[PDB]
Amino acid sequence: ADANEAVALSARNIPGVTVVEANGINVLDVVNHEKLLITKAAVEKVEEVL
Amino acid sequence: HVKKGDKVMVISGKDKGKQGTILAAFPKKDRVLVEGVNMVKKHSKPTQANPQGGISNQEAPIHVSNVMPLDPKTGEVTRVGYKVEDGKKVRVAKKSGQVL
Amino acid sequence: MKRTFQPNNRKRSKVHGFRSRMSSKNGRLVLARRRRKGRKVLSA
RNA sequence: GAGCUGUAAGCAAGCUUUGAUCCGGAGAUUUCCGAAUGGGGAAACCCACCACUCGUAAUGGAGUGGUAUCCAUAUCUGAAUUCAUAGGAUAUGAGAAGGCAGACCCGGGGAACUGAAACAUCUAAGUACCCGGAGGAAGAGAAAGCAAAUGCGAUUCCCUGAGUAGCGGCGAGCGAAACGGGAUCAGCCCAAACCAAGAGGCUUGCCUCUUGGGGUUGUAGGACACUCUGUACGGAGUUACAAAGGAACGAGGUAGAUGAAGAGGUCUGGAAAGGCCCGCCAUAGGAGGUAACAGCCCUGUAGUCAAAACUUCGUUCUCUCCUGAGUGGAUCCUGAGUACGGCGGAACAAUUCCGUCGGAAUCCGGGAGGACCAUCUCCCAAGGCUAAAUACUCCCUAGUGACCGAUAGUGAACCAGUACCGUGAGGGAAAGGUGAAAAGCACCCCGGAAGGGGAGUGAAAGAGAUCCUGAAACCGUGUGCCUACAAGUAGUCAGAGCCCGUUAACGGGUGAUGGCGUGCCUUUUGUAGAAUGAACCGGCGAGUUACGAUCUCGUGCAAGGUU
RNA sequence: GUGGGUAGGGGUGAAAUGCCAAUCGAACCUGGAGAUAGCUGGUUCUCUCCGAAAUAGCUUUAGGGCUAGCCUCAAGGUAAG
RNA sequence: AACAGUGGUAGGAGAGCGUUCUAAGGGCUGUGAAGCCAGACCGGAAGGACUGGUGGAGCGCUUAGAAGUGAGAAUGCCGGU
RNA sequence: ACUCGGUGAAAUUAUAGUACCUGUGAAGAUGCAGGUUACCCGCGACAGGACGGAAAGA
C-alpha cells in the first residue's frame, strides 16, 4: 500500500523478486514478472486511482 | 589472512589436500611459498654460486586464496576473524573461537 | 642532458630566442601557445 | 601490524614487533632560470656596490642579508618663485607588476567569402578575430513602470504568446513585447531641508568648515509645532538591512575498523568456480581476482562504527547594536548648465548617439498614456547598495551507457605533442597479447658464431622472446593427368583415354579432338577501340540527425482531441 | 670573411625581375572553413510486377531551373475508351 | 481448377537474405566455443547446414527493438607483396 | 657493352597460351570475318610496329 520497510528490506536480495508500492506499478514490471502478489489495501488504492 | 610461519592447507591445485608451513609471503602479489608444495625443476647454468650447476628442485609461490589456515582444536580449515584481546588485535578462528 | 642546435649562431638566438620572444606581446602569445600544446622545447 | 630498501632487473650491503616499508593531517629544507626585480644577457649564465662574519702580516678569496620600476602615505628640504611647487632625498607599505580554464560575462574595436541564381540595399554578422576588466559567477535590480482593469505592482530565468505583430530590392530572410502558467523569493541607506557643539571670515548677528542627532518619501512625505510612546529585558545582525569577536554541541571531507554462510561428495580434467547428487547465509546474489563460469576461497559488499590535526557547514550561548505611533500643515526641502531647445555629423515630423552651442521649473510641482489641444489614468527623474532562482566547468570524488575495442576510440592504450619535417610561426606519426606459474631449455651433439637435432620443463615447444589465433596476395618441394605441326578475352557445350573413390550422387580429377564465343566499370545517339579507371591482395570508405511543411498507414478518443 | 639593416594592399628607395627560405601577377602559417562550384569522379545484398523520354512554352535563358507531354502506386466514376 | 501472362536502362511499387547491439524465452560449449582450412550436401536468389582438421574460451536459436547495415571501381586512404 | 664471382634498384603494369594479309568496324584491329603461314625454350643485335615517351604546330 504505502511502502512498509520490513518487506522492502527482505526480498531485496532474492534474485527474482521486486517490491513496489501502489503508485509505482507500471507496464514493464507487471509484464516481466510472472506472478503478482498484492495486498487488499493496494488493490483498493489501485482501483480508486484508476 | 595468513603470514609467514603458519600451518596451512592447500585447497585448490595439483597439490590440493596437502598441508605445510609458510616459508615466505609476497603481499605485493598475493602469493605465498608453502613447503613441499608446487615443486619445480629449474635448469640453472653454472655460475659463481653453485659452480657446477644442474637441475634444481625448489618450491614456487602459489596464490594466497588457494590456501587456508588450520583451526587449532579440530585441525580442519577455518575462516579468519579479528578480535582485540589486550589492547592488541588477534586473528581468531571462526570455526571455534581460539586465536591464530 | 639535452640536444643543442647551433650553440654558436648568435643571430639564431637573437631572432628566434627566448629573450626575443619575451620582448613583445606577440612573442609571449607564441610561448603561451607552445606551452598549451605541451611542447618539450620552447623557442630556440 | 610483518615484512622492507620504486619502475626493475640483477648484484652487494643493510633496516624491522624497543614496530619499519606504506596511508592521511600539520610543518622544515627547497640549487639555478623564469613577472625576475643590483647591472648586463644568446633563459638555465657573467660582472658588481653596502653592512656584518670567516681567513691573510696585507693584497687576493669565501659566507649571510640588502640594493629594479611605478603607486600610496608621510618627513624634510626644496628648480622654476621667497614660501609654496616640479623635483630630490629619506623612510613606511605580504601594494602591483605575471600566469591561466581553448569554458562562462562586462566594455571597446570589428571583417570577408556566401546568399539574394545576376546585382541596387540587405544577409552573412555585431559572427570570426583583436584589445581592456574581472567574479565564482557576472552587469540586471525595487517604477517621474506597465497599461485602460474588479487592475498588477523590483530584478533574473523557463513554458506560452509566435515564427505572430512588425521590418524587409517588403523578396530572400530578420524578428518583438504585454497578458497568462512556473522557479526563486527580503528590500534598504543617503543628500536635502532642521537641532547641538567647537572655528573662520564677518562687527554681535551673520555663515560655512567640520563633527554628532535628523530623515527617506507620491490616493505625497519630511522638516516644523504640539501629543502620547521609548531608550530595552524587547528586537536585529556581519549576506544588502550603519557597524562590529569568541565559546560550546551536531553532521560532513581529508587515512581507516568490523563484517554471515561448503575443503560437501562424486566425474572429466593440467587445474573445477563446470556436470550430477546434496547443504547453508542473506539489511550481504555490487564488483574484481583466484590454474575453467564462485553468494558460502581471497579482497570485498549490506549494516554498523572511527579522527590526534587541518578544514566545510549548521544550532545555541556569548557578543555588538537599536524607538515608534499620533494632531496638525503657519513657514522651508525633496537630487543644476539638469529636464528641454538649437548646431553638425553621427546616423538615417524623420530616428537616436555623441559631441557643438544654448538654456527652465521645482508641490498650487512635475512626468508620462505617438504626436499637438483639452479630459481622465498611472507615476515621482537628474544619489548609492543588495542574496536566490540563471551561465560554464581546466580540475577532485562516486558512478552510468541498445558508446569504441588497437586502420576503431583522444593526435597519443606502448617513456606522444615523443620520433621525424621546417629558419620560424607551425605540421605531426608508427608501435598492445609467452605461459596459471619462468617452471624461460641443466646436459650431449654439428657449427667461429647465428641456427639447429636430441635430452629436459610444461596441458601444449608446430606456446622458445614481434613468443594467442593465425586468412589473401607472393614464394617454394613432392606428386595423379595433359603437353614439343601448334594461332586462343582462355571459358562454355560435346567428347574418348588415363587416374581415383564421395555429404552414393544420372560420382571426383585431368583432359587429345569438334562447335560457339571481341574483359569489368563509367559515359554516350552509338564502344572491342587510338573514350576514362584499376599492378595484386587485405582493411577502412558515401542518402544521417534536429527543427518546420505535407501525404499514407496504425492506435486512442471523438465533436471534441490534447497538455 | 665576420657582424648587422629594409617585411607583404610592404620591401628590393622608379624603372626595375633580378627577387623576398624549391612558394611570388602578390610570401608563408593558423583561423573564418566541412567556404563556394550549375563543373568532375564515386554511391556496397537479392528476387518479383510495371515501365519512359530525348518533345512544345518561358527563364540575362547559358549543358541549370519552371509549366505541359510521356511512367508508376492508391482510392473513387464506373463501362464512359 | 480454367484461362491468360512472365526481355528490359532511368524510374515507381512489393517480398525477402545476411551483419553488430539490446530485451524476453530456450539453450550450447574444456567429452572442446568463436575464428581459420577442406569437402562430391540443402534452398528460386541473397544464403544455410553436416562431417574432418586446426584452434584453446566463449557462442548461438525464437520473437521484438535500434543501427557507424552488405564494397570491385572514387588518378580513394593505410599496410603487405 | 659481352662471359665468370659478389651485391643489387626504377619508371610501367585489367587478366593473357599476345603471327601476317585482305576486309569490317565511334576514332587507327592482337583479341571481329575469310584466308595464308608457323616444332618447344633461350642469348645477342635492329629500331619496323612502337595507340612508348619528346614534340608542335595549334
Cα B41 from chain centroid? 20
The parent domain of residue B83 ranges over 1-100
Question: Among B60, B71, B3, which Cα is nearest to B35's?
Answer: B60
- Taking the C-alpha atoms of residue A12 and residue B60, their distance in angstroms, rounded to an integer, is 44
- Taking the C-alpha atoms of residue B80 and residue B70, their distance in angstroms, rounded to an integer, is 10
DSSP string, B14-55: TTTT-EEEEEEEETTTTEEEETTSSEE--EE---SSSSS-EE
- Taking the C-alpha atoms of residue B8 and residue B2, their distance in angstroms, rounded to an integer, is 8
Domain count, chain B: 1
State the residue for C-alpha cell 650553440. Answer: C7
Triad B23, B28, B32: Cα angle to 5°: 25
As ranges, strand E nucleotides with an atom below 7 A of a protein CB are 3-5
Separation between the CA of C33 and the C1’ of D395 (whole angstroms): 20
Q: Is the CB of C12 under 7 A from strand E?
A: no
And the C-alpha cell for C33? 601557445
Spell out the residues 6+ positions from residue B90 whose beta carbon is closer than 8 angstroms to its own: B82, B83, B84, B99, B100
- Taking the C-alpha atoms of residue B89 and residue B38, their distance in angstroms, rounded to an integer, is 32
CA B58 vs CA A36, B10, C18: distances in Å = 63, 17, 62
| C1'-nearest nucleotide to the CA of B64 | D298
Separation between the CA of C25 and the C1’ of D356 (whole angstroms): 40
Question: Among A16, A22, A19, which Cα is nearest to A8's?
Answer: A19
Q: Is the CB of C14 under 7 A from strand E?
A: yes
The one-letter amino acid at B92: V
- CATH fold, domain C1-44, is Helix Hairpins (1.10.287)
CA B77 vs CA A35, B3, B38: distances in Å = 43, 15, 20
Strands B54-55 and B58-59: unpaired
Query: Which technique?
Result: cryo-EM
